Design a binder for this molecule. Structure first.
Ligand code: ZN
Ligand code: ZN
Lengths: 130, 314, 88, 48, 40
């Protein structure tokens, strides 16, 4: 008959089925399943992935790709590529929304469920990026 | 020498802003000709009678002989010379009444900054000519040192502040409102006084469109130390500026409009002329300035702040 | 004459006669040079029109990136590119 | 995600009185010398 | 092995690259990595 395929996981996690209170730093850099209650749900914001620009003098379409530490599991060199307001030859670039790509981004706060939270102590929470 | 702070003055003698379009000379950005406006307002001052205003208002059966046929502004200028008065209150509809000034009325509404200065200059010239021509006993010197200013009013319908548009900036507007409070008298710097630290040489610099040029080096030929002029804040001269919070009560209110409150600035003699709680009618030019986002930075906000720069209060 | 050159002729146009011992090989100077930031990817152009100096670089690459001071982008994506971040 | 704001100019007024020490006046005088110089009957520098 | 400090980095990333001072390779390929060049 282009987007890369992602993965999702189900099944028993054993010692990785945890709680926001139970999460410590020994579980860092590990795949964990966390049961809780959502308290904060931030605004869904678009994140620029590739920006497409037009040079009217040469009549050409350029592009630039952007990345951060959130989208990748393996850390690489942080290379901050600025937004190109001009090309190599010095011509002015006009940005082309609609041809640029934006990926929806949200962050939620998962707090431990009050049913299995301690009845007097303050609850613990974590941030999840979707 | 205190000048006028209600309206920023314009230099009639200077040909800087003058551009010729084809002769006839026009201030750049306007359609105002200095010579033509001076001649038209002079003819209006010599030849206005209140029966013209009665004719304009379609009020014919109410015309009387002892008042309407008398030269209106001639007798106002006579009694203004007699009392030492330095202000002329000009009704804007009187300009529409006269045949030569219906253009000038429009030029008064669109470009008050140049037109009001033109009226001030020709009022001073007429003040001189009224004692030169009729050979009065008054000395010319006190008339010359006196600075005469005009206050136009009744400029039109009192449209709401929220019904104004950005193309109405620096136009004469008229607003009926209620005064809620006023700030104390604020000193605006007009002349700055600098003294050299090592030779005590003092110089005074006038302000130029809100910017004071600090002298980097001492003006004397003997002393030329960089960064030696220090500003003394108490030797320099200031001007009065007051901000009044007005609760506008317009004639027409759109659907679901909750009344707002504006800030209006008065200067010089008009300071403390408005107390809290009175219903007044303010005419003045519609101003907008950018507001600094932070105190430490000079990065200004893109959205402008609008206020009314007051000319006349009724 | 070459022996009459004094300190009063410094930075003045003088006319002097003589003979030539040696003409050196042609060095390559840069008139227009385009530069790119190492990691910031900021592109800049330097045009130089003063080539008459010897033993000293009167015009050089900037010591720091010029993207921050320009504030060209509304997004403006502490980040420091480092000392001498431009490549020709 | 906007572009570069641009700065541009246009001559409107006459400006201040020109000074012979100004760079613009020196450039204009040199331009006049190049265009208007005659050796005997021809513009040698313009033709050159 | 010391986590008992508060309000202050007793142990931090090195200010400069440690490849030059070690001289681990015989090649040793002026080159400066820059201030704070290490990433975690
Ligand atoms: Zn001094
Ligand atoms: Zn950079």
């Amino acid at each position: 008959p282009r987007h890369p395929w992602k993965l999702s996981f189900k099944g028993s996690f054993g010692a990785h089925a945890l709680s926001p209170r139970t999460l410590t730093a020994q579980h860092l850099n590990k795949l964990v399943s966390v049961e809780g209650i959502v308290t904060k749900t931030s605004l869904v914001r678009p994140k620029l992935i590739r920006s497409v620009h037009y040079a009217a003098k040469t009549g050409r379409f350029h592009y630039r790709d952007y990345t951060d530490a959130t989208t990748t599991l393996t850390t690489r060199i942080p290379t901050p590529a600025i937004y190109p307001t001009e090309d190599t030859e010095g011509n002015k670039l006009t940005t082309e929304y609609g041809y640029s790509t934006f990926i929806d981004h949200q962050r939620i706060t998962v707090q431990e469920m009050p049913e299995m939270a301690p009845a007097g102590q303050l609850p613990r929470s974590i941030d999840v990026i979707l | 020498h205190m000048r006028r702070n209600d309206i920023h003055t314009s230099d009639l003698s200077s040909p800087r802003r003058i551009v010729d379009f084809d002769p006839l000379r026009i201030i750049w950005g306007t359609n105002v000709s200095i010579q033509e406006c001076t001649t038209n307002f002079r003819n209006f001052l010599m030849s206005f009678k209140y029966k013209f205003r009665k004719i304009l208002d379609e009020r014919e059966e109410f015309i009387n002989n002892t008042t309407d046929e008398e030269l209106y502004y001639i007798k106002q200028l006579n009694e203004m010379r007699e009392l030492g008065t330095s202000n002329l209150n000009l009704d804007a509809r009187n300009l529409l009444a006269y045949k030569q000034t219906e253009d000038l009325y429009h030029q008064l509404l669109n470009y008050p900054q140049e037109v009001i200065s033109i009226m001030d200059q020709t009022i001073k010239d007429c003040m001189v000519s009224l004692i030169v021509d009729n050979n009065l006993d008054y000395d010319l010197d006190e008339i010359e040192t006196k600075f005469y200013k005009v206050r136009p009013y009744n400029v039109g319908s009192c449209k709401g502040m929220r019904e104004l548009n950005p193309n109405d900036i620096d136009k004469l507007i008229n607003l009926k409102g209620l005064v809620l409070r006023s700030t104390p008298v604020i000193p605006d710097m007009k002349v700055a006084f600098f003294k050299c630290n090592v030779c005590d040489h003092t110089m005074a610099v006038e302000i130029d469109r809100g910017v004071i040029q600090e002298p980097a080096r001492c003006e004397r030929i003997d002393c030329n130390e960089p960064n030696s002029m220090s500003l003394i804040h108490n030797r320099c001269s200031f001007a009065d500026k007051q901000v009044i919070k007005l609760q506008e009560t317009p004639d027409f209110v759109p659907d679901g409009q909750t009344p707002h409150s504006i800030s209006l600035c008065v200067y010089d003699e008009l300071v403390d002329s408005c107390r809290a709680g009175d219903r007044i009618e303010v005419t003045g030019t519609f101003r907008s300035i950018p507001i600094r986002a932070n105190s430490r930075q000079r990065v200004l906000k893109s959205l402008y702040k609008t206020y009314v720069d007051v000319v006349h209060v009724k | 004459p070459l022996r009459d050159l004094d300190s009063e002729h410094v930075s003045k146009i003088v006319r002097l006669s003589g003979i030539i011992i040696s003409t050196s090989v042609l060095s390559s100077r840069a008139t227009y040079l385009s530069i790119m930031c190492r990691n910031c990817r900021h592109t800049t152009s330097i045009t130089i029109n003063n080539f008459n100096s010897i033993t000293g670089n009167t015009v050089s690459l900037p010591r720091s990136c010029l993207s921050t001071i320009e504030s060209e982008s509304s997004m403006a994506n502490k980040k420091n590119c480092g000392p001498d971040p431009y490549i020709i | 995600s906007f572009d570069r704001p641009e700065i541009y100019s246009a001559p409107v007024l006459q400006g201040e009185s020109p000074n012979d020490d100004d760079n613009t006046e020196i450039i204009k005088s040199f331009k006049n010398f190049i265009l208007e110089f005659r050796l005997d009957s021809q513009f040698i520098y313009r033709d050159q």
